[model samples]
Target: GSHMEKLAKNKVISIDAGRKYFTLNQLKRIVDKASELGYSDVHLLLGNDGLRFLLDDMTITANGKTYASDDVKKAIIEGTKAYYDDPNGTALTQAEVTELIEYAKSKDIGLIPAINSPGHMDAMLVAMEKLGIKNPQAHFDKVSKTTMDLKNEEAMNFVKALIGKYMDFFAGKTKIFNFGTDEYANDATSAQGWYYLKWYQLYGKFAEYANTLAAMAKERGLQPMAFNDGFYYEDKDDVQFDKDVLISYWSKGWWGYNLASPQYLASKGYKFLNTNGDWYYILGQKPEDGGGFLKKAIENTGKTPFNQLASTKYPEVDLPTVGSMLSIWADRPSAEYKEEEIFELMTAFADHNKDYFRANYNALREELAKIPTNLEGYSKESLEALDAAKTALNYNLNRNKQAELDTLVANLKAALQGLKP
Candidate 1:
């Protein structure tokens, strides 16, 4: 049987490894895997830990001593080296940004470097401290509360500086700047009212922040993409979003039910993307581990489970579903979780996508089967059987050596194509 044509052109799928630090090599391997799975776009994010990752590079002293928590600076230096300095080599100077571009060029893929902003602003704080603009009240380990005071000019300058520095590193290679605007609540808030107030206030401010960045990005010939939390707040009905703002609808447990927000945005004239967390959170313990200590060691270890793909209301909506995103929110209580776990989790996500698409296709076929006989000559039964075969083919491919499954799908497709009108 002919290999399945790459999923779909212009269909955007990405992985959102939120603020988890990945070594240069690790990122390279992940990109390779994504290419193999035919992902069209990828977003490397900076959350809490990821910010620390970036800081580590800039704070390292000549004596070889490194700051306790500075990873964002390190990532920037690493990204710079990956892209510009070491064009043909691999080193701290060889920026992963360039390596990603090269990989995308080689595989015909697009890479979107995401720096979550205004909300996850620890990365900016670290940058500010490095630039000698220290926050008087900033300290770590007490609930990890580090957010940019949106009213601060210095904080805004810090963000603009970093964006300006890296904007040209990828130049024409990268066009989308993902400003993650989801989960924007104060974890330290003890009261629901206070939390809601803070959440809404921050979202409103972030929208303004995003608009600022969108203007800056447009000046550099790039577009802005942001995450939309339909579960947390009403879609920004009153706030004026930028024309180039790509609203990414990200939700868990409700699938396309949450798509109402993006659909509404599209109705009001905005380009959008769908990244349903319930159908794409693929972090989990390996299937073979079977709940052992090693399995626990390999799990995401974050407060939230990542293997949440099936939603309560999946496949019931009539909106433009623009694919999904898998996330790795790195929050482990111990160092037991190895880098291998990231690899495993990513592979699991790719498998999840294959299964999800197959299941939905089959479900569509099933629904068609229940239609009345007035549609008899429409080949509804054949359509249903074909989808079932496609699902079987995916299952067999994942399980290894399922040639018979492919044969069945091939035969079915052939029969369906030959059916008389």
Candidate 2:
């Protein structure tokens, strides 16, 4: 396959539009820019702290009780309201999502739908309580505002049913479903949830929860992926996760965090996505920003190789990797949408890693724009042929199809010269 074809199938740019209600147009622009740069997929985080995308049928059946779709949606919306509902927008309607999906297909870009679970359920916990699920939040050292009560059977059933609605909607439309199992109870445990899970002897259940979600996606013909925070916590092999789940290797752990490394995960037969957190670009943040991480993330995108995994200290070992992704996080959703800076970061990744991104879609689009605007003087048959040729031209075609596109360009030019009787 040509460079364009290969790159378009491997490269990805992820957006955290869940924490903030990024307008459809904002999401569309991200897709368009990624398509222009020849990235294959957009890992859309629609179920982080806030569930930004709500389905028409939100009805959830759990433990012999059915929550009406409307009521469920309302509760979820209320949950978002409690957690910083973006003034720009509250949530994307099903119709808007449909339009976005169609638009992505036209540009030959895939959208990886993510509805996180077992963690990052601020809005979801609220909905569970509103729907009469008592004490749905997990209790580690204290009450968790975001993490779900994994021990509560009814709560587990309810969350799964809710995620199933999203799975059903995206069954045939997407290739990967990201069930974000990152930061299990970091909010409640002060970012030591992974350690606490093992300390509390609940790591087995976490492993089981991951396997269940992975099976759900596989049963629907979609690949399952999760963050690499709690996969092999403390490198304990006693509890096992489904090997089918693709590991989005983003973190290498800190002083206390024990996230599995790319090498460790590969040993378990898990393929990887080089989601190096070093490449993260949090929206509305600058070099002067606190936490001192974003500045390094910006610098590392230019210094780090495209294929390198997260954390620069890793031994130079080749892991089983399918692709790479640059994540744009909205940890501070209230921060301004620094659109220009976001695009610049994306541009820097592609610019610095020129070999991985070799597609020239921008040139093709320019060529397509050259078609004659007025065909009144052309022959009807020739005009129809030109139209057919234009309609048949696929922007997603590999660079090897250059000859075919060239031929069509020539034919269109010839047809434009055809005189009417």
Candidate 3:
């Protein structure tokens, strides 16, 4: 495929802002750079362990009970603070999020909102309790502070309703909604993980939980997505999942922590975004200092193929994919923000996968820059012609249509030259 052809597909960059507060300006910078680099989307993890973004109408009616918007928002904010009080900022205001949506749209970049649930919902549990829900946290061998108890109807209803609020908010704004269905009860038993659900006869319920969220997203005209774990755990096919949900295939799982392979999930007819975890860079970690985890990740970013699936047992077998994603996490949110490293990693990814990503708008940008500030001197007819050309200018930056843009530029220049006094 030509560089243009390959670049036309999805090239995503995911940031874990849910754990660490990424201010409005920081997020805009990310979208801006991603747009400049021809990346398709910025996958924003807004509801990982902490729910960092809230809707204006936070009121949720669940279990035949209604919680007021202000109360809900306050509870969630308190919950996030309890988990990890990011001194920088706790949550993004509704206006801030709205501004970000518009900014990303202007840049021709998609935003994939991820509100992880069933697990990795540390703050929500606190919010539920504050809202008068009893024992919202799930339990396996030990109580899971993050995972919601599937059996509790009231708690489950509250969460589903809460997630619906976000789904409703993001509908028509984005193509995909990631539910973050990674690690079920790993907090209780890391080795057992999703396997515990099977032992306790709750695996089927887990499928229902994911499918229900998938349906919710689909109903709102959004494609659903989740991490590659917990779906078809241990290659079991008895429990079915919605094929519409895209899997962000990140890890293959370690010994005693068995997870479904990419091939097995593909066999089940699920599409994927190749989120190879090997390319992950933690915010505070360094290659030289500790265990050298980021070092291997840095090396892999330069070496790994864009289409390569993570944690796959068969590296040779290729799965039909939607695109690839590189993730930056804030596992240690307290760590200092290394702004340069973030961009450097992103630049390296683009450099390594040059064919898969690049937007050469230098020519169009140059042409647009030449436009005069004052057009009052030009005749009405010439002004109208210039207006039409300006209106037709393509900011979408379709690489294959560069020649068409060139013609537009040429015509624009001619219009400028043809302007009558």
Candidate 4:
């Protein structure tokens, strides 16, 4: 181990590679790169579509009120194929998942899974209807303002089946699961709005849906984690989540989608995994819950690049509260990515967190201090630009202190422009 490795004590860093599509080879690169950067986790988020591993033939939803069939056929046909834009492009076979899981584990990295639920659903009803649940209360719940109707008897059962299937599939292969219960509307909208209680107006409705999935996770001996956004819904009470639920805190800064305080929850005993949106799918910010894990949310387009690691001056994170993760949720398939940028962000993030990498930031900042004198080094405002870029690359800092980062970048740009240009 070099200085960085030696400095890195026992922190966890990981990555989430794409939106709903990434080839196996690409995932391997992500996992491998994360390991090299001292990461211990790798993740994939199921946005509006399902991943091959999350979808299986046995999906079933029923409640006597109403139900459809073909639960198995749909999983094989539309559930698997529709999610992937290509015929054979990004779907991974079971054998492939197993192969990758083993590969990551050998290097001490864990492969984690996520599936959007309760909210953020677009084709959820179609999926539910196919799996045996039928005629949901409404196309969209106007009360909870969710994409799925939680009050319906069949709908609730469908949720159980869906989450249960997710648990069963990932079983002993990994440790935790992400039920993307994020960004739910507080109440119904105008002509397109919602009712606090969409159906006959109710109380504790949210808990029914939330608790079901959470219970399923506990049943499997795995902790359930979710996007902290849902709990932020307006008029919310304290009954939404159980103590066992894990919080995946992606909100730092004033971004619309990420506006809420995971701090209150942290104080309440919930462990967090920071993947702040203001930071990425890019890097600058420290973990909101300093003691929790981190997600790289690392990315690059035309420029920038990958650090040291270890030391232990840290938080009061729970033991099961694993480490941080680095992620890239590739929204559009057409976007290009370079291996250099991916590795660069990972290295920077690991270095920034003493728990993850060495206490190199002080030295890195000193080297960064020389930027003014070294402005004209190579080309393209190269030295100065890269200097600010590197510090700004710490998504934790960037997301947490956007105002400061802007000033820093501007100063660097000024120094470059000030030199003999």
Candidate 5:
């Protein structure tokens, strides 16, 4: 059997903005690309310095600066003089959120509300002590922190209360809610403590918590999804939380996709999505690029999921990967891959969110149309860039959003407009 090239049928391409605020209009425009390329949802980093909202009594202060709940446009914009009370600075409010959610609805794009829990929550940790989140380490741990204090049932309740509060805002509006439990304080022991036994127990505890959160979302008529990394390296047999809670097995192009390879995660009786960050991440500020994740996957990681599994001695299954997604890593990816730039052009566009995804994407058809099969006068680098762009943009663009390219139209025109026949 020929390789399926597992990076097919992209269900999403997430735009993770850093704390800097983008106007509701800007986000609305960004989402149109996902809808134009036929994506099912728009995953935006929120509740941080990005598009903020009040979850009942939960207050949101921005970037270490104070805000008067009702009047935050100035503080958030000039967060540093920061904002200079700059009238032009863009800050989205609850009203703006209301507007974009509706605008996203009109575009057939559902919102995937992403809030980094107990671990990757620098903003929330500082913004509100009432939320009861703690970060003892002066330095940040990239693997992240424990989302909730397992020692206290009250901590678990804290998590539930917050999840339910936000769910109140986005519950029925969309089908899935993302709890972003990815790098959850796995190794950094200040929060979880040391010892292999402790780590195992902690992982299972988080899994149990995930099920609780998933069930909460289910109660509200939405499927709950979380980052797959926490469950990856821990013992699969010990993991009790399965089903209902969907997993997104993300990769930073390291840790060999962690202990939970596609085969590993599937064999455990769970459904998951793939997000090879380096490959699928839409590198902002750089066009026609995907930091090594793309180069590695097309050449190897994605070649054969089973083949990847075969390299491991573990028993394998059909590898139930629901779909693929590309991450934007807070919108500031500090790496790039120009080698194999031609085929390394995979977009986060190839990512999928649904638990069971099987569809047709016409990349070859579109690729051939934009890139000349016969390259005569194109410069070596120019053609390489063109070839690279061609390999990447060959997904299904059969939607009604020409303005979808409004953001990148200028770049597209400058880069590959000449290839148009």
Candidate 6:
């Protein structure tokens, strides 16, 4: 409840709370704080880790209980109601559904509500269990990178029910529905038919599901965004995607993983968002080498980090790279890692991106300045400086030295601030 009033005044601080693992009370506090800070938007993530939750406070105690208690569920519903009511005030009578619309009216920012489905289904299972769906396991898909069997009436109905419930709460204000259909790694020996079927046959069904969802979203005045992992399939002939669906390309390692796919997708008239892993994976850090106390101390220190690039040539994709995301996979992160991890990673990534963009922009400015006409251009000095910064950024990305990178980012920002018009 601290600084709740400031949050309601449209302050610009962005907060990515540590996923959905927080209790209802914790979430209420966060929501209250956001309202006070006047935050434009709040992003919530759920996965197979400890952070997964819905309205239920299925708080796993140190003892091993994971199911949501009736009290916890009620608390979640209460918290939701509170968020709805004072979306910008202190009252608990407001429904968060229309509060976002009112906030949009007052602050002129759209409420982009996203529910990652099919992929992140752990929390959904909790909801289904609460709904008293007997043997809901019949509706679950155990296969990776596999689409739900839409032909299965139960599966189809489940999807409709899930979307329909949220649609009622969010209504026309929800503009984007991000269906996560990535990471279904079907290896040759897996029992799933994914590897047996040609890549296109496998992905085509998934695309069909995406299109079906997109249509449903459209009917409710929402645009659809789907992850584009199938775009990486070598056999281009095996994959067919709908033109209307916006693709978000994400992969680990390097930019090269995204280049071909975005180019291929763009050629086919599809728009995409590029979020490569090497630079964006928050945990992808340079492993320490020395086996001693010094190394341990160095590793334990926290701040913005830097990573080294694998190669010099960045991906040259045809589609517009809208933005990027820094992934925080909490699968088995050690206890030493704390809530500050997200902030440290985000700060490092954002600083790296600014340097990356500035270098390019400066180079272009220099090029234009050299023309005989009055056309503006970048100086050769700017280009060289940009390349040097990029090289350093690449090195930092590969090597996870948060403390060192924090210093470098501070210097980079200071140096670049003067360059901006």
Each candidate: RMSD? 13.6, 4.0, 3.6, 14.9, 12.7, 15.7
| Model 6 TM-score relative to the real fold | 0.51
Query: TM-score per candidate, in order?
Result: 0.59, 0.88, 0.89, 0.62, 0.59, 0.51
Model 3, residue 278: distance off in Å is: 0.9
246: Cα error in model 2, Å? 1.2
List the global CA lDDT of all models: 0.47, 0.80, 0.84, 0.51, 0.48, 0.39
RMSD of candidate 2 to the truth, in angstroms, is 4.0
Clashes of each: 26, 1, 0, 52, 16, 41
lDDT of 6: 0.39
Which candidate has the top score in TM-score? 3
> Which order, best to worst by lDDT?
3, 2, 4, 5, 1, 6
Name the weakest run of 10 consecutive residues (lDDT summed) in model 3: 394-403
Backbone clashes in model 2, listed as residue pairs? 59-69
Error of 6 at 354 (Å): 4.5
Candidate 1 differs from the real structure by a C-alpha RMSD in angstroms, to one decimal, of 13.6
- Stretches of candidate 3 off by over 4 Å are 2-5, 288-294, 312-315, 360-420
Which candidate, 2 or 6, would have the higher lDDT against the true structure? 2
Better of 3 and 4 by lDDT: 3
Specify the highest-lDDT model's number.
3
Question: Which of 1 and 4 is the better model by TM-score?
Answer: 4
Q: Tell me how candidate 5 scores on lDDT.
A: 0.48
* lDDT by residue for model 3 (15-128), tens: 999889999999999987787666889999999899899888898998987999999999999999988999999998879988998889876688999999988899999999
Candidate ordering by TM-score (highest first): 3, 2, 4, 5, 1, 6
lDDT of each residue in 1-421, candidate 1, tens digit only: 1123224423344543443335566666666656544455666663332342232123332212333234545444343332223222322222555665686656546777766655555445554555455561122222323455555566566565565545545457787777665443344333122134344465466557667877777777877777764222344355556766766665432422232354456566665465544333233434563432333423322211222212223334444444455554433312233546555655554553453222112322333354346535756666676556545544313212234444654555654564443
TM-score of 4: 0.62
Better of 2 and 5 by TM-score: 2
